[PDB]
Structure formats: C-alpha cells, structure tokens
Amino acid sequence: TLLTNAEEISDIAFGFMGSKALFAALHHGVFTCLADGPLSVEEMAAATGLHPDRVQTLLTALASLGVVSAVEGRFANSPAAESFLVKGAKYDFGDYLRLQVDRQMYGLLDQIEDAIANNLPDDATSSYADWFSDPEQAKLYSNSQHAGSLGPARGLAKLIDLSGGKKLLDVGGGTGAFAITLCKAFADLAATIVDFPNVAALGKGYVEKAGLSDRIEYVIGDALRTEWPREQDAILMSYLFSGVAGDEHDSLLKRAYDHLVPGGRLLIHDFVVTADRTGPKLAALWQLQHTAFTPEARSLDDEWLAEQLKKTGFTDVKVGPMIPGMTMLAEAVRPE
Amino acid sequence: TLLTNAEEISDIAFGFMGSKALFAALHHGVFTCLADGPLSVEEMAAATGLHPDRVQTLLTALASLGVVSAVEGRFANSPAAESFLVKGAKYDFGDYLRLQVDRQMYGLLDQIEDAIANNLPDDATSSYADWFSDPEQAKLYSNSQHAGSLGPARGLAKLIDLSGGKKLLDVGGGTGAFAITLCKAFADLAATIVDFPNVAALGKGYVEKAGLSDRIEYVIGDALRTEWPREQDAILMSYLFSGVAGDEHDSLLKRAYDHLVPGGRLLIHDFVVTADRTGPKLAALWQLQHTAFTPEARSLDDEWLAEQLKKTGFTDVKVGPMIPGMTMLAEAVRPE
Ligand SMILES: Nc1ncnc2c1ncn2[C@@H]1O[C@H](CSCC[C@H](N)C(=O)O)[C@@H](O)[C@H]1O
Ligand SMILES: Nc1ncnc2c1ncn2[C@@H]1O[C@H](CSCC[C@H](N)C(=O)O)[C@@H](O)[C@H]1O
Ligand SMILES: CSCC[C@@H](O)C(=O)O
Ligand SMILES: CSCC[C@@H](O)C(=O)O
C-alpha cells in the first residue's frame, strides 16, 4: 500500500485509538462477559460495572473494528474474540495484550521521538538491563512474554531435531518458555539460559516448577559481558538481536558460531523485514517499538541476515516465517 | 467484517505503533526532507540529523504503512505525504498530528482504562476547562486545531449562505478558524466566539491579524455557565458535543434554539457514529479519545441527533457527512 487520501493518513494517525479500545475492553473483561451470548448495552453495563453510555462508546468502537458484532442493539464476540480474547480459551492471550503491550509498551513508546534520535534523557528506560533493574517490571514483562512464547516454541519443536542427548544455549531466553518447551519435547536435551539476574531469578521459578532444574541452568549476567558455555549443539537467539545495539550484531554471530559444535545449529527468531523493506508491517512496527528502549538497535532484514550468516561461516542458511506477519526464523549450520 | 484470525487482532493491538511511526517522523521532518525527491538512508540520516540505522528502521516502518514508497534503495513520499505532511504544503497538517495528537492525545488515552470506568485519579485531566487552564497545553492544542480546521471551514462556507447582515454565535469556536473563514467569506457577517480564557487569549491574535477585530468578539468562559448573546442568525457547535458531559446535550440544543431568531440556523459539526453503531471507525475512535478526558461523554449518533433536534423544535433537519469518514454536519432551522 501507498497512501493517497487524507483519510488514509487518518487511518494510520489514529490507530493508537483502536489499540486502546481493545486494551480497555480487555482490562474490563468485556469479551469474557459476551462469552455466553449477545448482550445489550445495559446488560453489559450490569456485567462489568461500567456506565451504560461508556460501554456504548467502547463497544461502538470495537464493533467498528470488527472485534465484536453489532446487531439490533445487541453486541456479540467476533469468532476471533471468542478464540483469543476470552479468559480461559485454549488460545486466549488478552493478558499478554493488556499487561505487557498496554501497561508497558504503549507508554514506553512515548519515548521514540527522543529514542530514534539517541536523545533519550537519563530518566528514561534506555535498555533491557536498566528496565529490568526494577524486579516487578522484570516480572511483569517476563510473565506475559513467557506466556506468549509457549505457542511459538511448540511450532519450533516441530521443525528442529534436538534428539540425541544434546546441549542447548538460549542467549536472552528470559524465563525459559523456549528451553522448557524444547526440553519437555526432546529426550535427554540439556539447556543453558543467559539472562539478567532479576529475569534469571524468575526463570528459576518457571524451571523448578516444570521440574527441570536438573536439565536447565542460568548463566546470569549481560550476555555481551558474560562467558558462554562452549561446544553446544544448538544456540537459540529469540528476540535478542532486536533488543541489542546494532554494533554487537556481527560479533554476536561469530560468538554463536564459535560456541557451536561442528554441525551445530544456530536459531534466530525475531522481527525481520523482507529486503524490499515494505514489510511485513507488524515486524517493522515491532522493530520500532524495541528501538524505544534500545536506541542503538538496527533493522534486521532476511537478506542481510542470510549474507552475514554465510560470511560468518554458516551453511544451509534458511530464512522463513514463524509468527505470521510478525516474526521470522533463520536456521544456520556450523559445517560438520 | 468480523475478525477471526489472531493476526487480525494483532493488526489492531499494534496499530498504536504505526501512529507513532508517523508522528516520530513528523517530529524529525522526514517527509519535508523527501519533498524534493527520493533519498537514501545516509542522505536522510544527514537531513534529519538521525543515525542511518534509526532512519532505516523508521523509514521501513513508514514504507510498510504506506506513508512512503521503497524503490531501488531509495525512499519516496507517498502522494498523501507529498501534499499533507510536507511543511509548507498547501494542505499540510503535519503539525496538527505531531503536536496535538502525538504530544497530547496519545498520552491522554493512557487514561481510558480508568476514564471509561468513571474512575480517573485526582491527578488525571478530566475536562477541557481543567486542561486548558494550562496555557502551554491550550496553545499547543489550539494552534494545531486552528490549522486542521481551516480546510473544513472553507468547505462549510461553500455549503451555506450567511449573507445580508447576519450574526453568528460559535460556541467553543476555539481560536476562530471557522469564524475567521466565514467572516472572510461573507463581508457583512459578525461573529461571537465562546471559549475558555487561555483559548480566547490565543484566538484574539488570530482574529486581529486577520483584520477582523471589529466583526469578531470573544465571550470568555465556560459556555455552560456563561450568557450567550441572543437573536443570532447562525449558531455553530463544532467539536463541542464530543468533549462535553452527555448530561448537557439536551440543554445545549434548547439554548441554541432560544438564542436563534426565527428562521435562524443551528450547525452541529462533530464526530458522529451511525445509529447501527458500525462506524465510521474514525468517528467511533475519536469518541473514545474525547472520553479519556471527558468521562461523562456519551456517543453521539445520527438518529439521536436528528430526533433531539426535532424534539427541541427545529425543522429542515438534515445530517450528512462532512470530513470524510470522520465527522458529520447536522443542519437545523428554527421555524419562521
Ligand atoms: N545483553 C543481554 N544480556 C542478557 N539478556 C538480555 C540481553 N539483552 C536482552 N536480554 C534478554 O533477552 C530477552 C528478550 S525477550 C524474549 C524472551 C525469550 N527469548 C523468548 O523468545 O520468549 C529478555 O529476557 C531480556 O532480558
Ligand atoms: N464547556 C466549554 N465551554 C467553552 N468552550 C468549550 C467547552 N468545552 C469545549 N470547549 C471548546 O471547544 C473546542 C473544541 S476544539 C474545536 C474548536 C473549533 N470549534 C473548531 O471546530 O475548529 C475547544 O476549543 C474547547 O475549549
Ligand atoms: C518483545 S515482545 C514479543 C513477544 C510476542 O511476539 C509474543 O510472545 O507473542
Ligand atoms: C480535536 S480534533 C480536531 C478536528 C480534526 O478532525 C481536524 O481536522 O483537525
């Protein structure tokens, strides 16, 4: 798409408003109340403790975005709302949306005007490290991040083969949604996670809870200033490049390569744009979001990633989509 | 449409990142830099005083949104960008977006979770009066609004005839964009604008520099508590109902009626949704925005509006589109 109307510009300009319609509805459990069938404005006001005129305004906004249906003064969940937004649904993720995206990201992106200029004040969150210094933020971000990564981890376990008592290193693997998943999935697979203290202390909870403190250890600290375990069969870097300065990118690949065993695989999951750089829109937007608290970030495209993977010494380099319209998966092999 | 895919939810959830892409770009003069022709990342890094990497991330987000094209390594302004976002463009409204919408509205919407629950915190901005008592806030808001309203004001003059010695009352007419424009058109017209002190203080500047001091006067204050002149020929309310407690809607129509000579016209320009509450999307979302700082706002719909107008006593009551996909205009005549 290339914009033509002033209205089309307005569509983009006021997109934050629609995001906040969804977010607010989530906080007040709107889609959960609709789960048992259509409701009038007044029936909703009673179910949520909101004033009728306010719900009318909230729902009207929702209906206009297709998130709910509006038929004869009664509103109902869209199929997508029933699947993904109703509390308890197998695929529910309203909580990732309202806690991490709304409570943290929305406000945080008020920083980009300064960030894309590397003009941040000191009283701004300028890194993951700085941000996570606040344990209750670290826990707020991780807890939803974890929840959100479980699905993609499963999809991941279906492509790669870690069978054969192997060793996994997840650099920046947070609270362990990917390692925990790949370990439960693969026989005799052991894993290390490199992540910051406050995050690491939270992962240790998720890992002991899974009953896997025998197979999964944290090397705690800043990955860039902390020794990794060498001779690993597989390295996972998921949303690491995005939250890391762009000058680290080359030496990040060299290190991954150096810490691999011959035939070892490197796995990079992240917001990646096509090389023509016209999308995918969700990934480009998320690159920007990360830049808000990572002013030195750069933009990963699939071509660049391919080429630098090869010039690092990797072979069998492949790049494909993971989270539809949002992330990609790059696979690399240190040669046998 | 009625959404079904998790990616469709995602489109909306992260729509706010795209608003911010546009805004950050306006703040740094991106499109004005692309005004003379296509540019590369280094050149754009140069003209915007941004790092080539942060410009790449920014422009890439912009391309995937449609705001720019991405060709042979060089970025270009979309046609819409050329004409609406380039400073000095005949129809430029970039400053309205980055100053009023980005610097004020985006942050204000952080209140809706509480505002929709009629439970804002004491430190929350909870009305126009509250908000504009801050002169910097009033200035920032009103210099943009004046600009974004000049075009629609010309459109409104072309739709109506206020000739032959008329008196116009513009309630919450702000810095007088409309009034100035309709006075410029109809040489014998006199106007009266009713708006808050910090706003009127600005308006007078815009009025004097137009050479209209003799024909346009302010009545400073909360319109709800201040006496309006009587025997008017037209009464304009443009974006007044949106930001006012729903409590007060009936009795605004009545006063307008009582302050009109027989055969005089009431004009209501505002974000109005349709009675089926299906849209327009943009009006529905601005209704939610105003509610963030007007917790007793109610949804203005077209049917209610025409009905209340007849209820109050008007005739020749029509409602039609005004700003495409965003606002409507309701015309009514007090019987001859
Ligand atoms: N320099 C650094 N050192 C250690 N951890 C880092 C880091 N930079 C970013 N991180 C961590 O990288 C993680 C990014 S968020 C994603 C979590 C997980 N890898 C997943 O895919 O679900 C965060 O947990 C953050 O704490
Ligand atoms: N209760 C009130 N009394 C006086 N002015 C009010 C008001 N409530 C809102 N307003 C004003 O109405 C204006 C809304 S913005 C639009 C201004 C102008 N009528 C235009 O359409 O371009 C603001 O200037 C705001 O200050
Ligand atoms: C930096 S948050 C990205 C995580 C998101 O993709 C998810 O877990 O669904
Ligand atoms: C408070 S929004 C101003 C109205 C808008 O539609 C414009 O044209 O500027």
Mutate to test the interface with B, among A14, A249, A270, A323 (most CBs of B within 10 A): A14
Q: Which among A47, A77, A46 has a CA at the least distance from the CA of A59?
A: A77
What is the Cα–Cα distance from A124 to A106, expressed in whole angstroms?
14
What is the Cα–Cα distance from B34 to B44, expressed in whole angstroms?
8
Residue A15 with chain B: CB contacts under 8 Å? 15-16, 18-19
3-state secondary structure A104-146: HHHHHHHHHHHHCCCCCCCCCCCCHHHHHCCHHHHHHHHHHHH
CATH numbers and ranges of domains, chain B:
6-87 (1.10.10.10), 100-333 (3.40.50.150)
To one decimal, the resolution in angstroms is: 2.4
- Cβ of B145 below 6 Å from ligand 4: yes
DSSP state of A277: S
What is the Cα–Cα distance from B109 to B15, expressed in whole angstroms?
14
Q: Could you tell me how many residues make up chain B?
A: 336
Contact B176, B206 (CB under 8 A): yes
Q: What is the β-pairing status of strands A39-40 and A74-77?
A: antiparallel
Supply φ then ψ for residue A28, to 5 degrees: -95, 20
Closest CA to ligand 4's atom 2: B145
What is the Cα–Cα distance from A110 to B110, expressed in whole angstroms?
11
Tokens of A170: 């997840």
What is the distance of C-alpha B261 from the center of its chain? 29
Residue where the block lists tokens 């993951």: A128
Q: Could you tell me how many residues make up chain A?
A: 336
What is the Cα–Cα distance from A242 to A230, expressed in whole angstroms?
24
Residue where the block lists tokens 């009006």: B283
Q: Is the dihedral of CA B119, B122, B127, B128 positive or negative?
A: negative
Phi/psi region, residue A216 (left: phi>0; alpha: psi -120 to 50; beta: rest), is beta
- Closest ligand relative to A93 C-alpha: 3
Supply φ then ψ for residue A96, to 5 degrees: -60, -35
Q: Which among A78, A86, A101 has a CA at the least distance from the CA of A23?
A: A101
Helices (H) and strands (E) in chain A, counts: 16, 10
The 10 Å Cβ neighbour count of residue B121 is: 8
What is the Cα–Cα distance from B165 to A205, expressed in whole angstroms?
78
Phi/psi region, residue A147 (left: phi>0; alpha: psi -120 to 50; beta: rest), is alpha
CA distance A247 to chain B (A): 10
Q: Which among B255, B199, B205, B202 has a CA at the least distance from the CA of B225?
A: B255
3-state secondary structure chain B: CCCCCHHHHHHHHCHHHHHHHHHHHHHCCHHHHCCCCCECHHHHHHHHCCCHHHHHHHHHHHHHHCCEEEECCEEEECHHHHHHCCCCCCCCCHHHHHHHHHHHHHHHHHHHHHHCCCCCCCCCCCCHHHHHCCHHHHHHHHHHHHHHHHHHHHHHHCCCCCCCCCEEEEECCCCCHHHHHHHHHCCCCEEEEEECHHHHHHHHHHHHCCCCCCCEEEEECCCCCCCCCCCEEEEEEECCCCCCCHHHHHHHHHHHHHCEEEEEEEEEEECCECCCCCCCHHHHHHHHHHHHCCCCCCCCEHHHHHHHHHHHCCEEEEEEECCCCCCEEEEEECCC
Tokens of A233: 């069969």
Helix, strand or coil, per DSSP, at residue A273 = strand
Residue where the block lists tokens 């109340």: A33
DSSP state of A284: H
Q: Which among B100, B87, B110 has a CA at the least distance from the CA of B141?
A: B100
Nearest-by-Cβ selection for A277 from B20, B60, B101? B60
Q: Which among A265, A286, A278, A279 has a CA at the least distance from the CA of A329?
A: A265
Which whole-number Å values give the CA distances from A36 to A22, A44, A123, A201, in the listed order? 19, 12, 46, 40
**Way it was determined:** X-ray
What is the Cα–Cα distance from A154 to A152, expressed in whole angstroms?
5
Q: What is the β-pairing status of strands B167-171 and B232-238?
A: parallel
Rg, chain B, Cα only: 21
Amino acid at A298: R
- Residue B196: CA count within 13 A, CB half-sphere: 17
Q: What is the β-pairing status of strands A315-321 and A328-333?
A: antiparallel
Helix, strand or coil, per DSSP, at residue A5 = coil
3-state secondary structure A13-79: HCHHHHHHHHHHHHHCCHHHHHHHCCEEHHHHHHHHCCCHHHHHHHHHHHHHCCCEEEECCEEEECH
Tokens of B330: 């309701």
Q: Which among A185, A313, A190 has a CA at the least distance from the CA of A255?
A: A313
Contact B68, B75 (CB under 8 A): yes
Residue where the block lists tokens 């391919």: A306
CA distance B269 to chain A (A): 17
Contact B19, A113 (CB under 8 A): no
CA distance A188 to chain B (A): 34
10 Å CB burial of residue B163 (0-12, 13-18, 19+) is exposed
DSSP state of A85: T
